[PDB]
Paper text:
We have then added sybodies in stoichiometric excess and determined two datasets of [name]/4-sybody complexes, one containing both binders and a second [name] only. In both datasets, the position of [name] subunits is marked by the binding of [name] to the extracellular part of the protein, whereas in the dataset containing both sybodies, SbC2 additionally labels [name] subunits. We have thus pooled the classes of all undecameric channels containing two to four copies of [name], and proceeded with further map refinement, which has allowed us to obtain maps extending to global resolutions of 3.8 Å and 3.3 Å for the datasets of samples containing either [name] only ([name]/4/[name]), or both SbC2 and [name] ([name]/4/SbC2/[name]), respectively. The two cryo-EM densities provide congruent views of the relative arrangement and conformational preferences of [name] and [name] subunits in heteromeric channels. In both datasets, the two positions uniformly occupied by [name] (referred to as 1 and 2 when numbered in a counterclockwise direction from the extracellular side) are well-defined and clearly discernable by [name] bound to its extracellular epitope. Similarly, the seven following positions (3-9), occupied by [name], are well defined, whereas the two positions adjacent to the two [name] subunits in a clockwise direction (11 and 10), which contain [name] or 4 at different ratios are of somewhat lower resolution due to the averaging of two different subunits. Whereas in [name]/4 heteromers, the [name] subunits reside in the preferential ‘down’ conformation observed in homomeric channels, irrespective of their relative position in the channel, the conformational properties of [name] subunits are influenced by their environment.
The calcium homeostasis modulators (CALHM) constitute one family of large pore channels that contains six members in humans. Although sharing the same number of membrane-spanning segments, their arrangement is unique and differs from other large pore channels, with an extended helix located on the C-terminus and forming the core of a cytoplasmic domain further mediating subunit interactions.
Residue numbers in the entry:
A (entry chain G), F (entry chain D): 37 to 305
B (entry chain H), C (entry chain I): 38 to 305
D (entry chain F): 37 to 306
E (entry chain E): 35 to 306
G (entry chain C): 19 to 306
Amino acid sequence: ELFSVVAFHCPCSPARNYLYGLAAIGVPALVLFIIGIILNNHTWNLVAECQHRRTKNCSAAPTFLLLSSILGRAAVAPVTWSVISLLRGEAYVCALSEFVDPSSLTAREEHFPSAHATEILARFPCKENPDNLSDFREEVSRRLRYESQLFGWLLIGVVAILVFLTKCLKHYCSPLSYRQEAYWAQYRANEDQLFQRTAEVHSRVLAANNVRRFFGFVALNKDDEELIANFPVEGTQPRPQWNAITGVYLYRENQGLPLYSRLHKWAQG
Amino acid sequence: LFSVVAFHCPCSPARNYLYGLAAIGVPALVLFIIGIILNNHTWNLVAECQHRRTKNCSAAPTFLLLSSILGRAAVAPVTWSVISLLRGEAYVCALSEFVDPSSLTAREEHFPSAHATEILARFPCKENPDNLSDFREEVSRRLRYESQLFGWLLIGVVAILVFLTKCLKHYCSPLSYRQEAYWAQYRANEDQLFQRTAEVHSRVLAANNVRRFFGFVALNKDDEELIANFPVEGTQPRPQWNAITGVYLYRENQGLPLYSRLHKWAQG
Amino acid sequence: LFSVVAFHCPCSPARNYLYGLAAIGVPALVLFIIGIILNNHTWNLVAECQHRRTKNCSAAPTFLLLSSILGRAAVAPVTWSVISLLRGEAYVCALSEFVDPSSLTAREEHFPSAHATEILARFPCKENPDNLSDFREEVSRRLRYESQLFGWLLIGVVAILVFLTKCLKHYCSPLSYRQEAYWAQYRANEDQLFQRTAEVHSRVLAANNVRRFFGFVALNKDDEELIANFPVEGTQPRPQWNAITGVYLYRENQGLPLYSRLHKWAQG
Amino acid sequence: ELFSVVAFHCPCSPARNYLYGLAAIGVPALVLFIIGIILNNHTWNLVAECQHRRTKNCSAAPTFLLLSSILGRAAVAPVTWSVISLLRGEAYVCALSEFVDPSSLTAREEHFPSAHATEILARFPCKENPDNLSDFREEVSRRLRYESQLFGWLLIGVVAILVFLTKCLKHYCSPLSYRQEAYWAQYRANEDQLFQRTAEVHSRVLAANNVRRFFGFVALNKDDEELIANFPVEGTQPRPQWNAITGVYLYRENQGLPLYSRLHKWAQGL
Amino acid sequence: SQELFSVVAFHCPCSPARNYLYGLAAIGVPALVLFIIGIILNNHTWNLVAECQHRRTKNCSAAPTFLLLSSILGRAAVAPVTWSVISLLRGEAYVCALSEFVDPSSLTAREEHFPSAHATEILARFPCKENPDNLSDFREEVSRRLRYESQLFGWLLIGVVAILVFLTKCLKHYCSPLSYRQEAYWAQYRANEDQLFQRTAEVHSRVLAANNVRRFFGFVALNKDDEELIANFPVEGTQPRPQWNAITGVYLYRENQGLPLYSRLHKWAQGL
Amino acid sequence: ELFSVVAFHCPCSPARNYLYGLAAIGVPALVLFIIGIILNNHTWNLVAECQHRRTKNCSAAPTFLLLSSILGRAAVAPVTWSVISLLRGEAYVCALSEFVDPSSLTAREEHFPSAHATEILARFPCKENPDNLSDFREEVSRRLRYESQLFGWLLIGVVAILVFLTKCLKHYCSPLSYRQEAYWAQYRANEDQLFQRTAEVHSRVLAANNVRRFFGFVALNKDDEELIANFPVEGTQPRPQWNAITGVYLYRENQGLPLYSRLHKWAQG
Amino acid sequence: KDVMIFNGLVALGTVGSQELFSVVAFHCPCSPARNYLYGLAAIGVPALVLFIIGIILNNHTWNLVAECQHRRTKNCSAAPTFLLLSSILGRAAVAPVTWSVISLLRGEAYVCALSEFVDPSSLTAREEHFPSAHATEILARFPCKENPDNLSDFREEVSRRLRYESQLFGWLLIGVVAILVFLTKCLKHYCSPLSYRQEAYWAQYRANEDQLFQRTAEVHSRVLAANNVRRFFGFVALNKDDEELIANFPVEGTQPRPQWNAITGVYLYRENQGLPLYSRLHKWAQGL
């Protein structure tokens, strides 16, 4: 059971668990955050922009709109994991168990020992406390869980406000009516489907034309014969030609009619 | 799961009413913010503030539409505020510390006055002495009454508002209601066909660009008719897009009504 | 689900009787509203004042229509109020504090006179000493009788009201029921095919507008014949639309009975 | 119950379990690491590269860019086993229970004996501890499990950075845009799967061409009869021809056009 | 089968100088039986035998035999190892074997309460639980050290094999004159030829059986599918023993005119 | 059930149970050995071969290898039953219970009575022993059961080697390459299946003619008429011709071509 | 084959019946010189009876009698008698043997038998304690399991030693029948004039002819009866199948009485001038 593997087990110890809780929640967020950048294609072409120029010709301000998109899109993974842990509250209570002031404790009279304070409070999350302090143990358990949930509900509130400000300003300051942007956002996600689809077909066709010249024939299934028959290949596309359809693109217009993707710009020569 | 969003009452003085505010206000706020974004009637309104850059249009025409934005998006917070009030757990945890010890009933003068607020704080969590359980049960019902009381009357004031808004809407709209019904069926019919054509006119332009690169575009059996039946030569000008976005209030043309800016653009 | 919509008595004097009114009347009140909104007869009756703004129609001709509208929507208030009265939950919670202790019998005088109302208020919540269980039981059984007695005669009131009105409606109306059955069927049938024609005529105009913008419209197979079958040129003017909505009471034209304003408009 | 056999059994004995901790975690890691190298086709054409030249003229500049890929595509398997063990915590606690400082125990007063501290601490993972020290064990067990679970999470972080570091350099230092590399990635697999598929068929046709000469006829299934009727062969492929499509290929452009596989380089006749 | 498993299951005889004999038999012999099965099923061992039979002069040197002999054991020594390893990891076999060899003074967890009257006898009784209750702590102590010593060796044995397999695989590719890719085709050819051979041998067997029965009974009875076999695959006679004698024997890549021959049969198909 | 009846029941009695153990093991082995000989077809033509010559015309040496095949094929059942009994150990303990030397007994101080050594040692397997010597009954049982399992494992080992030894020499000493034996074996199995299949068809057709000749007709199922029409009988086959295709057969060549059975030799004319 | 399954069901049938018999109805009469006779009858009587239904139900048995009564000279050759006698026993005499062995194997049948013969002085593990007058009587009560606990010690050894004898005796019986079957099969093939392939073909033919004979005979009865119905009514009503038979099977008539007698009895296996004849029925057709 992988649930038992990644389960949050609180090491009840002073000055030790908050260090653990920091690395038991932040690190999965870091992994989740890293995944978002890696998979999002909007960051490779941004990287690819930095490699071809080798000079830093392009200004930062035009690229900041796209730079905020990769971080923004990938920011769901940390938030949806930072929030879920906070609401569960197990992460926080084990983290902040040892900072509770014994003097400010409530629900009971001043019978809390002060010989070794942090040691007893640190052991609260694991329930390894004498029942004579069970009221104290429960009181801190509830109060600390309260701050987690209050922080958790605050966290989701802040994200919602940020999204509202982001989308409202993005539509306001963009120079295209939002209906056109929907068509544009229905293009880049449509071109990439066709471009990936023909990438294999013009690869497999080029694969068969290589094996055949070696073996003397090519094994194929019933469908693959249609690929060779319908779509013949003659050669390969030049490397600079590949260089002209990678990078970032920001609504460069031609003659008064838009070009929606950098490939479309190259399709006009 | 429901366990994560489940209401856990922190039985503490001057603290739980903060939590109830957050555990109810924020989910209400997050629903309301969701409502605005999804409702497409606000973006063109936002886009309306952009193209003019002058505010030529007065607020009076906008106000009739602006109500339809917040109101149509206010259903989600209301149905979430109601259930929380009807459930009652949030309210009792909210006002437990404000119960007057003097107004306590169903028992003799046995409730301690040493730390009333502290004792009153721990009522929602069953952290109470059995001797005070009668007091706890009394406030467990008196407080739950107010929540269920507030829930029902807040439902009623909402309910009459729907009737008041709808009747006034039919009272103030110059066109007859049955014609408005046709207008409602036209907005859905145009939006679907426009959206359905948005994908197709995107795909045809998509294939007409990949082909220039690879030399051929791989299409399945059904997408093949898309290229054959629907050929395009280019794109549409930005001003042309800029003339069919925004708000529209029943501009009549030579005795012929127009129902959408696109229709108004279709008449030239 | 059903847990949220339930009755829980606040065992408090001068407070529970408010809850009983709120916990039943308001759910009945909203159900009363809902019937009005769904019915289409209200808006045209509402729209009648809009097209005149002068009170052209007198009170006597228009008073006849008002009777039918309220009764149709009155189904929800009566289909719910009597059900709660059958359970008797509202009555026992509401008027328990107002039960006169003098009429209490079938037991010796044991109920305290210090707080008679307060003890009475806590009966529904099962909070009562076993010595007063007899006092609780007698009133609980008495209130359940009165609630059911009240609830049962409500059904009879409904039963007689529909019966007398139906013959009165037949007697008052100058039309035979066989004539009324056909006429009523016409409205219930002409509306349905009016709505279906509305969408088809809505889509056809919608398709034409998009084509003038994109250049081609992506329709399914069934929509393809829609363009071929029903091609339109423009729309219908607002006065033509206005001549449809409103109320109508069986005008006659040279011995030809007309059954709808549309039929009245059909002859020109 | 095959998983039950490989289950961890901590030998509670001083200076002994950490050896077992190593050899019951390292060895399956070593086995998983070796498997990654063996099954990875990119490691054989590396070996066959230095084999046929017999001189090692080529420098380390082209080798290191591939050698990392050999381990990288294979070193993931040991790590996803090394991290899993650390998260479970069983491997570490038994390994290091001997080294716990007898002066660093808390949650109890000075009740730890000093006669054989290492010995008594060694038996903590086996729960064979007298009930007068049950507080001590539940302190050491939970403390050591922290150290493991901290190391496991940290190790995941280091891979979570090395992958992102590598994926950036592999796209910033390579002379090809990523969209072209995806094609070059979609071509290496497209050719190899065709090659394996066509190798099997040209094997069977050659086989059926010899068995016939030994029996006068060949038994073939109904669908296999189509194979012989479609893909006739005339002989075998010479060894030097088989020796020019084995090895490492590094983006040799031809007359201004690219070649994506070493086979492709031979396909143009080079 | 719960009864069959119960028969083979280990039953340690707690007695000195006796159990490790059984432990040797209870693991060694099933390993030996598995190893013998590995030899017989390995088709490469027979044409190896047939090679040592037909030539009668030991024509082949050590190098042609050594390269093949490695494949004989490698494809067969897997079965003993995965049985020896599985036994060691279980640890029951080892603890029964060495229960009479731990040094009493090396024991711990208890003071010098270990009797020295007949040390070997009492130690040997540990695996079968047949121990006095006062030495139950010692019983568990030895029951764990010996489990360890088995388990460490069990894991160590797997590691050594996982090195030899990698070393053997790497050496073969570096030493053979063929490219690794051409060997894959060569491996993909022996399987196709063998499967076609065995399948087509049956058909040329049944036809000969059908032809001979017809001469005796006067006719032959065939199933629906066998009817096609007689017409589609007619035979005229048998094949001489020397013809059968040119295709059974180890073959190591004799190239012809610069074009390879991939098996004895292929060399015969060219009449060489 | 059947297993309950044939369940071993050790007769605890001196000088008597080892007789029972032999019969309760040997007889099941002897019976199973007979079934191996009886069902095997290569044993009857061996006997039938002696019928025709009646004078030992053929030498015993060439026919010896067949005798190696008949014993080897049949011996699987006795061994697989002898081994199972040895591994179970029930047979052996009751067989040798009363032969355990009291002097060599261990795991107990010398309380073993000598008044009836054999008798009390005979009763050990059947729980009819004093509880004061219960540890001995466990000690003697475990040592004896150890001896049984060692013999069982040694026996299966020797059978394992002999199977290999008789299969390494058979290929070596046979005059044919092992592949020819593959065809020869696949031919024999094909011949017998086809030969037996035609016998049913030939008989059913022949019986039809006799019944038709005597009722004037025959009652047939759906496929019988197909059998009658497709395969008509023209008579029977002489006995001496049948005799030429019975009996053992060694590989004999004709004009440089093999003949794989007497039926083949007969079919060649 | 078909023969083995036919025997197997019978072997299972008696074993189950023996298990059923040993539960509901077997109570050893613990009375001297009464259990001994009871024990012997508890084995032989089912054995002798079960052998009898084996003979009666065997069709080939009356074939032997028919020839013996017809020939009155025992002119049947040794080989056909070897075939039939080894056929009936192999098909019938199996059932008593299986009952006999399982009865011995369980031992409750035998333990009653020699309980009388048990020597009081042959007992061990203690001094012999039995009166010279009631020694036989007390032993007879051992199998009932009602013996006093004082005599339980001596009873278990006696009830087991006989149980030892029964299982050993039952096993020894299995050896004899197993050897005999092996001995007979060799004698059957050695003394037969034709090889086993001939014997296989012949016995395989015998089943097919008699199976064909039975099916035809039932049909011939129906068609002959139907034709006489037509003669007695002038019309016949038939279903789909039977009506096809009358149109497809002409009525040859009534066969001569000697012809029926010629096709019953033992088979002389006289080769028709070298051409084999596998039954009397085959000879009759080839004879004419």
